[model samples]
Target: VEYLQVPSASMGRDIKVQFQGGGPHAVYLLDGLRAQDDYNGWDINTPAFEEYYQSGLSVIMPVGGQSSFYTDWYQPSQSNGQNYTYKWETFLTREMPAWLQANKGVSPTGNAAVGLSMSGGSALILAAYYPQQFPYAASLSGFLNPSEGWWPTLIGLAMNDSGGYNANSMWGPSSDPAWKRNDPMVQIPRLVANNTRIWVYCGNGTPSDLGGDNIPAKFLEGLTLRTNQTFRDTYAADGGRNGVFNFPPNGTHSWPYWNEQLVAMKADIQHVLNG
Candidate 1:
């Protein structure tokens, strides 16, 4: 029942944070492409908060950033227009961490990030960019390789379909370097430098067991699975030993699978925060 507001110059508004604060260690929970403003999908779709209700952890769930990929954008959104370019990178890295450390008692570094779908990749991106602040990243059904072949086009179409956001406005068309910068596969060296603890997961998109009705998300699972597999294999080839790759046999891109993953990885997250 408590909310904290961190002022964001990149967004031209306060970034609202809903958290169940218990200890000094913080773990951020990021939303998907079509994120809602009022409450994060983690709170809405899963019992994530309950998992850490009064545990020795601070679960940070920021509300907003729809189709932004949780990254900084070059231009303002097509719908929200000129108010401010999406500066999620700045907010999540610099601004939010500063405020959380000052206002709250959480440390400014040695944190973990978790995300699914769009944010799954964002989690790894953040860990790669700011290894000290985000040492461990868990990507559940994330598009791990966005800089590859037709991925930039697919992501652009996804952004457009999700929120009418322009891809050119994001990182300047498909030719920009930002896509490669954000791609988890491309950032493997950064992660390896810090030996960043990684948790990779994806499903085979088999809707046989899970009962849900997200045709697009369900379809995306298979494609995402391939990318995740590629990322895992690539990481292994790079001699990365600090990772847990989970490719379940039957699953989809729905909240149910993510919820199950959260439950499965909570202990690993706890271990990283302290170990």
Candidate 2:
């Protein structure tokens, strides 16, 4: 229950980061779509913090990146319903490391990050941007596309929640021309150049036997497919560090499937940490 805030010069909002357990080896766990307001995504929904405590894995959970995609924004929220702007990318990759070293004894040279859904993609982007800090990264049922399709639609929808959709507010809208620069697919080559360690998993977007709305599940399916294809195409051509992609049969976007994946990936995460 350690509560702390990582103050940011780039993003106005004070980044809330929660740490659990005791150790130098830390795992930065990012949250999912709507659950970014707090660390409850992994803290309450999954057994990650509890399972990794005795294993010496300190967990860093960031709160709030809703619609930010963990990226620095270009303009204000187009919808501008409120002042909820976020520069999460900078906070995670830049300020976070320095702050942790000074305050939490977190060794910048040794740490990893994992995320689910949106944060899953954030985990990869963070690791890619700062290889010196996040040596290992993993994601489950993560949204993997920024270049095309329903992502913009969803982000638009998210923006609509507050007002109008404004990609530029987050990534410098199409008008600013920096949008391409912020996309993960565009950033993958940088990761290829760096030989970073990464692992990811996504399930079919359809509902599982566990039962729940399957639309989101299916949407995640499209995301995984596109991202996995991108990963394979890039890795096959370039020859850099590789990651494992899992498509668990009959699994969906709901918690039951996510919980199952978390349990299975626990050992893999430890191995990544040690590697």
Candidate 3:
């Protein structure tokens, strides 16, 4: 089926999923903060699913997570009077898996996940905590460490600007450990412990010919370089092997770079899933 209305008892809503069932191997592709209710950005901005078609794999994309980090919220998020809880962790790791396995022949465990921008760190976070559920994970231009310094405040500003949602509702306050829990920097140890197959891709915001120059995208991606480098360095320092790390000389934070990455990582994603 192209679209699936998967049940989410935790969130009290029927989550929309873009799915193309194939072999038992599946990859859960997540969305960014500006994730739209209509469709995932993979479909909107890039030819994301084209690479996976008929490749003995399944593509699962969850729709509608704008301003949400795709995390389990501490409170009912109130954004433009849209108050709702987000139990995304439970839904992705449990509910959706159950439904997919029973109905679509997809396995409940041993999947891959890939995300970009706002969801880049999120992809690793999921794999770190739910090692069995996601044995392989990749991040493209992600903010791997957001729990430090003014990152929380910046995240809060981004959230509010996106949809008038409050960051505190998502993970309480910066003082709360939830921020740390969701942070890739803090949770990467779990990835190391699990020995998950990882991929970390980042551009230094030099505006390459592949991904054109957008000032905001450049600066935004430029900001992410240090933290992504830290994540990569930490991964290496923590004895993390069985992964691919991409640090190209030039690129920005736009879809073109990510679109190209989807092509570049296609073989690896397929290899891990079919392994």
TM-score of 2: 0.85
Per-candidate Cα lDDT values, in order, are: 0.87, 0.68, 0.86
Off by over 4 Å in 3: none
Pairs with steric clashes in candidate 3: none
What does candidate 2's lDDT look like per residue over 87-149, in tens digits? 677777788878988987888766777877666777777777788887777777666666555
TM-score per prediction, in order, is 0.96, 0.85, 0.96
Ranking by TM-score: 3, 1, 2
For 1-275, candidate 1 gives per-residue lDDT tens digits of 46878899767799888977788888899999989988999999988899877667788999999898899989887654646688998999999988888888888798889999999999999999999899889999999998899988898888888868887788786778987888899988888888999999998887755464568767999888988988998898887889999987878889988888888887897888876
Best by lDDT: 1
Query: Which 10-residue span in candidate 1 carries the lowest summed lDDT?
Result: 208-217
User: What TM-score would you give candidate 1 relative to the actual structure?
Assistant: 0.96
- Per-residue lDDT, model 3, residue 160, is 93
RMSD of 3: 1.3
